[PDB]
From a paper:
The [name] (GR) is a ligand-dependent transcription factor that plays a central role in inflammation. The GR activity is also modulated via protein–protein interactions, including binding of 14-3-3 proteins induced by GR phosphorylation. 14-3-3 proteins form a family of eukaryotic regulatory proteins that act as dimers, principally heterodimers, which recognize and bind to specific pairs of phosphorylated serine/threonine residues, thus forming part of a regulatory system with kinases and phosphatases. The mechanistic details of the GR–14-3-3 interaction were further resolved by determining the crystal structures of 14-3-3ζ in complex with GR_pT524, GR_[name], and GR_pT524-[name].
Peptides centered on the GR residues pT524 and [name] were found to be the strongest binders with Kds in the low micromolar range. Of note, these two sites belong to the GR LBD. Similar to GR_pT524, 2 GR_[name] peptides were observed to interact with one 14-3-3 dimer and [name] made tight electrostatic contacts with the positively charged pocket of 14-3-3. Interestingly, the electron density allowed us to assign only 6 of 13 amino acids. Mutation of the phosphoserine [name] had a less marked effect and led to a 72-fold loss in potency resulting in a Kd of 1.3 μM. The two sites we had identified as most promising for 14-3-3 recognition (T524 and S617) were phosphorylated by [name] and ROCK1, respectively. S617 was found in a relatively disordered area, that is, the loop between helix 5 and β-sheet 1, but within an ordered domain, which, to the best of our knowledge, might be one of the first examples of a 14-3-3-binding site located in ordered regions. The GR has been reported to dimerize through amino acids found in the GR DBD and GR LBD such as residues P625 and I628 (42, 43). These two residues are closely located to the 14-3-3-binding site of the GR, S617, and it is enticing to speculate that phosphorylation of S617 and interaction with 14-3-3 would negatively impact GR dimerization.
Residue numbers in the entry:
A (entry chain B), B (entry chain A): 1 to 230
C (entry chain C): 616 to 620
D (entry chain D): 615 to 620
The structure:
Amino acid sequence: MDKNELVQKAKLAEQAERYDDMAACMKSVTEQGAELSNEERNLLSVAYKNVVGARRSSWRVVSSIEQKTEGAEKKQQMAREYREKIETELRDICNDVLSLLEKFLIPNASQAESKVFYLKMKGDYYRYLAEVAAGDDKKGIVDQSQQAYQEAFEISKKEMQPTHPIRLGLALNFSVFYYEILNSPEKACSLAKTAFDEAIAELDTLSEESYKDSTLIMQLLRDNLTLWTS
Amino acid sequence: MDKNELVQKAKLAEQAERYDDMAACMKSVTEQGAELSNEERNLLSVAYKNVVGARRSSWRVVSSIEQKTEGAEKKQQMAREYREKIETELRDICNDVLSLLEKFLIPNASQAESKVFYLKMKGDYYRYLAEVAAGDDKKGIVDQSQQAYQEAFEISKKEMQPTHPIRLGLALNFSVFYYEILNSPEKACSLAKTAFDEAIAELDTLSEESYKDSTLIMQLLRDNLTLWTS
Amino acid sequence: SSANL
Amino acid sequence: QSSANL
Ligand SMILES: O=C(O)c1ccccc1O
């Protein structure tokens, strides 16, 4: 009943668009040590996506301003220091999520579905760290992202159907990682195309409860392919 | 920090949509004691509008949930305690703004334009307090809002042109106050209609620097009239 | 509906 | 930008 109250409070915070409150509720649920249900897993994922998402969006705006103010030394230095402040928040949020994944989520995942979901999530949060990392630190971070995505990729190919939304969502983010982080448009296109074509060949495997999610991800995979081959 | 530096940081925070940072910068500027420029005044106004705005929006969502929970006592209690937590934040923000207006902004306003601006702002933040107040203290809060708006209304009619965005914006919010706080649809309609008709009769007084703001407020005044007379 | 920034 | 998001 206590865990159920924290989950109800998280759902209230979601509706009120108070994502710091939502993330704090779901972090406390996770820290209780019990394996999360599909609903709890999704509430934790939505909460942190919005929390980290606000920083990634702010980072992109401030970086664009920093580039556009070349020539104006005072304006550019200010944009640089504000970008550094946003990066610190971003790193603190990513480290919070990655710590939850290492200590509770990945070790307790008893199903292929949840294990793939958390390893993809580990891949995503190291990728967000990689977007604002530099030097030696970056090489290690990028490596960690690739290793998490690779293990999730192998499990999904072995245990899930090609139309499974989690398998598809992983192929979408792993292809984004190759394009944006590793600067490999051909590997990114090959991954995305294979995932799309294998799902298209087995549309009979779609379920009524998840066909919308599956078809939406397939559309996103093909949108990326169109963009990357233009 | 330096005044011009704090203002530049506030403009960066605005673009990054980091309104807590924006408000903290502008609060520090105000506390330096010097009269704010038109730009500084607007940055302070935008910052706090967004800070308080997020709480007003969350309050409406949570109150609606609490009301639709009529029948489930424990679940209703959770939404009620969450609404109260949001109200506390909302009151703290309003009290912050109202304190800045009384101590620095209203006493140092050296022009009719800035005096009207700050008194409208005082009207607005007491109106936001009135939206979440009950019974006995509500009456005093409602009176403070009406008095601020009334003094701003008299100065604007005497010193500003009917198309002035500040005069129009004040008529828009004062009419909202009559409709939503005093439950007087006819006085709200009369105030909004007079403001719209007087601006329509003098469209030759529009300036290139503020015709966009003036015409947008005129559209909002007429939208309210249409809604309140339907 | 009040003032728009 | 087109990721899952996640
Ligand atoms: O449609 C309006 O409300 C309006 C407002 C300003 C000027 C001309 C207009 O038609």
